[PDB]
Every structure is written in C-alpha cells, then in structure tokens.
Amino acid sequence: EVINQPMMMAARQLHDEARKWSSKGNDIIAAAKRMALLMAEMSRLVRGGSGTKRALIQCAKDIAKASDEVTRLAKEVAKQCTDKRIRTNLLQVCERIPTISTQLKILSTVKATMLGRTNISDEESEQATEMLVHNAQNLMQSVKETVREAEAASIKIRTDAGFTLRWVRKTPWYQ
Amino acid sequence: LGSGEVINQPMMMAARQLHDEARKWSSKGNDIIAAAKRMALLMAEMSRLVRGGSGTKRALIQCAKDIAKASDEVTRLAKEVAKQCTDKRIRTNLLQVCERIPTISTQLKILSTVKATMLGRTNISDEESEQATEMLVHNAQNLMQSVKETVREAEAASITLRWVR
C-alpha cells in the first residue's frame, strides 16, 4: 500500500527514541509512543479513502491531546532540574509543541475536507498535503528532542524532588 | 544465532531470580520490596558493566555502592519485622538470613572495585582476571539469594508491612 513516506519516517524515528524505554512510571514515554502510533495512522489516512475525512480530523485531535500531555509533563521535570542550561533548552523545545499541534489540527481539517471533492485543484491538494507533512515532521522532531532533554534533565533533579519520572530499559525476550 | 547482549549471564539470572520474587508484591507500603526491586535492577546493570566499556569502571563502583545502601535498608527493615514476630522458628530463621546481607554487600563492593580497576588494563593476567570475576559473581549470587530469602521470611513473619498482590 502507498502511504505518505515522510510522515511514516517521522513516526518511525520518534518510535525508535521511545521504544527501548518503559512506559511504567513515565507518561512522557507513553505519550511519545502513542503520538508515534498516531502519526503512523495519519500517514495512511492522508492518501484518502473510505471514512478518512472523519478519521483524519479525530486523529489530529488525538495527537493534540497527547501533545498537551508531553508539554505539561516536560514543564514539571524542568521545574525540578537544577541545571539551568538543560532547564532552558527543554522549556524552549517543549513550549513550541502546543502551537504546532494546533496548526496540525487546522491543516488536518483542511486536508480532510479536500479529500473527496473534485472542485479542488492538484496544486492546492498537493500543497495542503505538503503543509501537513511540514508540521508533522516538526512535531515529531520536537517531541523526540523533548524526550532526550527529559532524559538529560532526569540526571540533574534536585534531591528534594516533587515530581520524577522512571527511566528503566525494556527487557528483551532473550535476557 | 547471536548472543543478544554482552553480559555475565549468572549475575543477570540472579537479578531476575530476585525480581521474580519481589515482583509479586506491591511496594506501596513495603520498603523491603522497593529496596529489593532497586537492587534487582542494580544487579542487572552490574551484569553488563563487568564486561567493560567506556564509563564502566566508574559505574561499576557507583553501582556497587548503591547496592550496599539498599542492602542496609533491607537489613534495617528486616530486623524491625523480626521484633514484632511472636514465633520462635520464623523469627530465628529470618535473622539468620538478613544478618548475612551487610557482610556480603561489603565484600561485593570490595570485589567490585578490584574488577573495575582491572578493566581495560593490560598488566593483569588471565588467571587473576578470571578469579576476580569469579569471586565477584559468587557474592552477587549470594546477595540475591540472601535478599530473596529475607523477603520471603518477612511475609512469613508478617502478622507492619503490606503484602498485597
């Protein structure tokens, strides 16, 4: 089947940055993996099909829910981080995410409505798709870097910590 | 056809043995279980670290120290459990197991240092290397068994702690 490659590649990249970590005691990692799965779906929805209009919109909303989650959790860990540089670079990258997901929702509602109509030109169809991919690549890249910075911030947490995530690798089948 | 990891297997198995025992119980109100889980993971790491690599020497030292701190916690808690118990057998058997842990923990550290010193070092013989690992693994295994059986003896004394699935 012919999906959108750039969005699957983004989905796949983010998944690699989260998959080796456990979701137990780490809602950031869980959110990441959920978002990666959702972008995988979007990658298939964009080419259009039966029930795609409705699915694509709902999909965008879901990514926006998980986004607001990663954002807020990132602001907590940053609150406990004693290193200012790491606390600065995490706040920058994470506070970007809400704006992008909002634009994702917009662009997804756009693409959704274009799917099916004949009154749309190929120029306007392709461009709307390009826009959607652009925001997708950024979102997935932002979250990916928000994850890593959280892993860096986890080392520099104040001993009198209010909030702390769990960072434990996943056990393979052959351990 | 590939090994999968570069680990000392016996040490990993010991880790998992204790994890299996600790996993059963909740930690919400049971610090021995919490400590056991920590040590289990700590040990799982040691099994990788003793095989070497950039940053292992120091992390093998730090890993050992953590294990010894958790060893203290287990011991201190186990003793408090022994106090409340009103059975001659169970109380006695508990103290026989949990009192061994401080000793094993200290020896672990000592041997953890020895191995950490001779990682990435050419002036160390095969003999001396082999035996150093051997001594280290023997105490690693002993520690996991001691702690495992200390966990079991606690719930047998439990009439406080929380022992819910």
Partner: peptide, 17 residues
C-alpha cells in the same frame, strides 16, 4: 546521536527515581 545499550544503562543507573 542515537543511544547505545551502554549509553541507556548509564542513563538508567544515574537517573534519580
């Protein structure tokens, strides 16, 4: 860059919990 097994271990180990 992307993390190795030994990387992720040192993270796990050092990670305060």
């Amino acid at each position: 860059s992307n993390l190795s097994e030994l990387d992720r271990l040192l993270l796990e180990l050092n990670a305060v919990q």
